[PDB]
Structure formats: structure tokens, C-alpha cells
UniProtKB/Swiss-Prot annotation:
Inducing stimuli: During differentiation of epidermal keratinocytes.
Gene: EVPL
Subunit structure: May form a homodimer or a heterodimer with PPL.
Ranges of the Plectin repeats in the UniProt entry: 1-34, 35-72, 73-110, 111-148, 149-186
Subcellular location: Cell junction, Desmosome; Cornified envelope; Cytoplasm, Cytoskeleton
Protein name: Envoplakin
Similarity remark: Belongs to the plakin or cytolinker family.
Function (record text): Component of the cornified envelope of keratinocytes. May link the cornified envelope to desmosomes and intermediate filaments.
TM annotation in the entry: none
Interval of the full protein contained in this chain: 1822 to 2014 of 2033
Length: 193
């Protein structure tokens, strides 16, 4: 819905929603999984505020207490997948898929973010609404053949998240599947105790 990422956590013990930040702090969600969920938010348009559905840049999120100080640095990297970057030579704005091809960023750093973009409707073209399908991205040279193939093969995505309920290792796609929608906000919440 609305091409949003996983937004927050569903506290199964109290039947209440809570933020990723609160869940990590209360030991309801493992810290690494929490950080990756926040990266996915940065990479798709901003950190989600559960109370309003608004989304915020990393800096604005920290100032509003939506994230911890210790997350800010790594979240800025993920945020580039949304904003794109400026080419140091040509000064043009590049998507991160183009940055990889131009040698400015390593493929390994960028793939997870393109994966989350794909799973929420398609690749992001910086400064534009409307997601780009993988095949269109490939034909335009926005991504390489290898990145396209990796993005297409959803069943093979890395299982680097831990389901707080089952303790199973899940991919981002599987994690999305475990989510409920919040009755108030409509946003995706991952259950945790």
C-alpha cells in the first residue's frame, strides 16, 4: 500500500503498535534486524512516523526522536538510494544503480536497497514519484544485467532479518509477508513480543 516499506512493530503482548526504535530498546526486536528495517525506510523515502504516516529524512527523523543517534550515519548511506547522488565530475544526479556502474559505489552496498525498492513497487528514480520496473531499468542502463537478475530472483534474496516471533531468518520479502496492517494507520507492522 502506498509503496511504503515495513513501518513498525506490532506488540503482540499488549495489542499495541510501537516504533522500530522502541522495539529495539525494549529488546522485542534484534538490533541488526531493526537497523535494516530502518535502512529500508531511508531507502524508500524516509523514516516512518507511525503516528502521522509522515516520512522524514534521517536528520529530521533523529531530531524528532524517531531513531537513535547511533543509527544516523548508516542511515545516511541508505538514504542515498532515495535521493540519488551527485556525480563528482559531471555534477549530474545519479540513481544508486548508475553510481554502481560508474564506479562510485560498490554493488554489495547498494543491492539490498534496490531490493527493498523493488519489493515496494519498483526502483526509485531520484526526484520523481512513480517507480521503475526492473526490465525498464535494465534496458535504460539504470542497472546492470547482473543486478537485474539478482533483483528478479526474489526467492533468492538474502535472509538477513530475524522474525521476532518465530526466530526464523527471513528475507525482506518474507518479512513483509509476516506483517499485519495497523487498524488505525493502515501501515505494515511486524509482530513481536
Amino acid at each position: 500500500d502506498d509503496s511504503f516499506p515495513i513501518a513498525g512493530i506490532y506488540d503482540t503482548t499488549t495489542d499495541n503498535k510501537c516504533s522500530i526504535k522502541t522495539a529495539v530498546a525494549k529488546n522485542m526486536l534484534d538490533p541488526i534486524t531493526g537497523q535494516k528495517l530502518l535502512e529500508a525506510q531511508a531507502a524508500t523515502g524516509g523514516i516512518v512516523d507511525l503516528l502521522s504516516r509522515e516520512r522524514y529524512s534521517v536528520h529530521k527523523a533523529m531530531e524528532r526522536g524517531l531513531i537513535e543517534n547511533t543509527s544516523t550515519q548508516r542511515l545516511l548511506n541508505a538514504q542515498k538510494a532515495f535521493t540519488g547522488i551527485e556525480d563528482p565530475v559531471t555534477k549530474k544526479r545519479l540513481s544508486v544503480g548508475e553510481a554502481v556502474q560508474k564506479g562510485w559505489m560498490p554493488r554489495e552496498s547498494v543491492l539490498p536497497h534496490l531490493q527493498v525498492q523493488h519489493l515496494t513497487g519498483g526502483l526509485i528514480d531520484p526526484k520523481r514519484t512513480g517507480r521503475i520496473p526492473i526490465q525498464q531499468a535494465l534496458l535504460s542502463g539504470m542497472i546492470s544485467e547482473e543486478l537485474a537478475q539478482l533483483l528478479q530472483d526474489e526467492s533468492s534474496y538474502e535472509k538477513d532479518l530475524t522474525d521476532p516471533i518465530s526466530k526464523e531468518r527471513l528475507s525482506y520479502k518474507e518479512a513483509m509477508g509476516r506483517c499485519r496492517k495497523d487498524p488505525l494507520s493502515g501501515l505494515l507492522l511486524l509482530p513481536a513480543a
